[PDB]
Amino acid sequence: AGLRKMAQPSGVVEKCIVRVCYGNMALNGLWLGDTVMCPRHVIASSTTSTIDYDYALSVLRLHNFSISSGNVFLGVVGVTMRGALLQIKVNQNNVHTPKYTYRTVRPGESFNILACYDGAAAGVYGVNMRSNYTIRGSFINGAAGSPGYNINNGTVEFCYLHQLELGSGCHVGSDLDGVMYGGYEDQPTLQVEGASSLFTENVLAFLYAALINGSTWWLSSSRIAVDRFNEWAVHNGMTTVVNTDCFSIFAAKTGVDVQRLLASIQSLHKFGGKQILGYTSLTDEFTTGEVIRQMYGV
């Protein structure tokens, strides 16, 4: 029993972090095979005013790089731009490179952050990609280059390299293709994240987990069809429901159908001094997949 936002074990990824320094700039890189990937702003001469990255790369001093895995220093062979990343070829292969893929995640999908400083893992926590393409992270100045990953069948799927914090505190990264999530710029500008909508499918997962854990005081007997829910959502900061069928497993082991939870969601949207699994507000950080794993192991 119980539900916790968890991370997958980080060991396979820890072996891939390197420290990448250039001038007064220091951040983290991901060392896979003979390549290091890191945010391109490590070569920016200042990160406080606008940057011309092509100019910065044109005047790169290759020997001014210091890339290290622990006390083992990597020689830089070449550097190319890859969207908002540098792809740095180095002289040594990482023998501890796991089997890996890249994937761009979509809003509502969960992944793992390995929070890194000075090229060493410091913390690991789970996150969920918001509808405005930001994440609710904890990162301070040295954290750019911290990877986001998922692990499926021993293969590490890298989906995120940390880049920046918006003026609001929302955190933004790029995919391993170098495409910034949400189209935000890797510039110190005044960009503001879009309105965020709670991911209804995830809220439903949380409420089914709540039921399985014996929490029922909020359960409605009242019911509401998906369609009348969807019209209500778009004026109340929640998304729409299209797979009412990822919940079939949950409806069978609890006896509660989606439409009863959808009616509970509308009342719980702004709890009455009570809590659900410790929460005093609806949370959308848990996916059906996460809940299934924690409740049943598969």
Binding site: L27, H41, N141, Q163, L164, E165, E185, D186, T189
Partner: peptide, 5 residues
């Protein structure tokens, strides 16, 4: 302003 971290 955005902070590049």
């Amino acid at each position: 302003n955005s902070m590049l971290q």
